[PDB]
Amino acid sequence: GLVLDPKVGFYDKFILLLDFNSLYPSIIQEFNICFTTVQRVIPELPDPSLEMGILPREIRKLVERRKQVKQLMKQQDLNPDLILQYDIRQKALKLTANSMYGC
């Protein structure tokens, strides 16, 4: 957990605020961190030649489901209540992906 020293003071111009989209799940997906790949007994990350583990595959499927929902959300002439269900499904996938690291 790295915290950058905040610049205390008052700012006159605009302040643009940017946030990471699921930093830890993206790290897990990128570097293939899993139970079946990391050699443990700070462990060294696996080489890129290895395949996807169970946990990265689960996160990939979680984002695939979000892709499916988002594409189905873009569909026109849909039931007005089904847009709400698509929104709730998107949110649920968001929190599931974000909390994947918490385990």
Partner 1 sequence: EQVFHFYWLDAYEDQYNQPGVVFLFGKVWIESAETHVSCCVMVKNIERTLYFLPREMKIDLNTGKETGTPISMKDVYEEFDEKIATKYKIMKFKSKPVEKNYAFEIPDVPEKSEYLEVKYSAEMP
Partner 2 sequence: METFDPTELPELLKLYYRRLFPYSQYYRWLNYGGVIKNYFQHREFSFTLKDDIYIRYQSFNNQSDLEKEMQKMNPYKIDIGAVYSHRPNQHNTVKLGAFQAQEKELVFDIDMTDYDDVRRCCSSADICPKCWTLMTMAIRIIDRALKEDFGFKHRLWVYSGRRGVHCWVCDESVRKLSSAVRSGIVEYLSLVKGGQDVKKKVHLSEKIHPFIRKSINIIKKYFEEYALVNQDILENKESWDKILALVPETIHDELQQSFQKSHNSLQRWEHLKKVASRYQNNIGPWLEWEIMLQYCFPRLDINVSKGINHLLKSPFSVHPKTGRISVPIDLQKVDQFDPFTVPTISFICRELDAIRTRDYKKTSLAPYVKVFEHFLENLDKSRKGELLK
Q: Which residues bind partner 1 (CB under 8 A)?
A: 35-36, 40
Residue 43 CB-density burial (10 A; 0-12 exposed, 13-18 middle, 19+ buried): exposed
**The one segment of 18-26, 32-40, 76-84, 87-95 that binds partner 2 by CB under 8 A:** 32-40
DSSP label at residue 102: G
Nearer to partner 1, 39 or 49 (CB): 39
Of 46 and 96, the one with the shorter C-beta distance to partner 2 is: 46
Q: Which of 39, 71, 76, 79 binds partner 2 (CB under 8 A)?
A: 39
User: Rule CB under 8 A: is residue 52 a binding residue for partner 2?
Assistant: no
* DSSP letter for each residue of 32-98: T--TTTS----PPPPPTTS---HHHHHHHHHHHHHHHHHHHHT-SS--HHHHHHHHHHHHHHHHHHH
Minimum Å gap between C-beta 57 and partner 2 is 14
Q: Which residue, 38 or 73, is less far from partner 2 as judged by CB?
A: 38
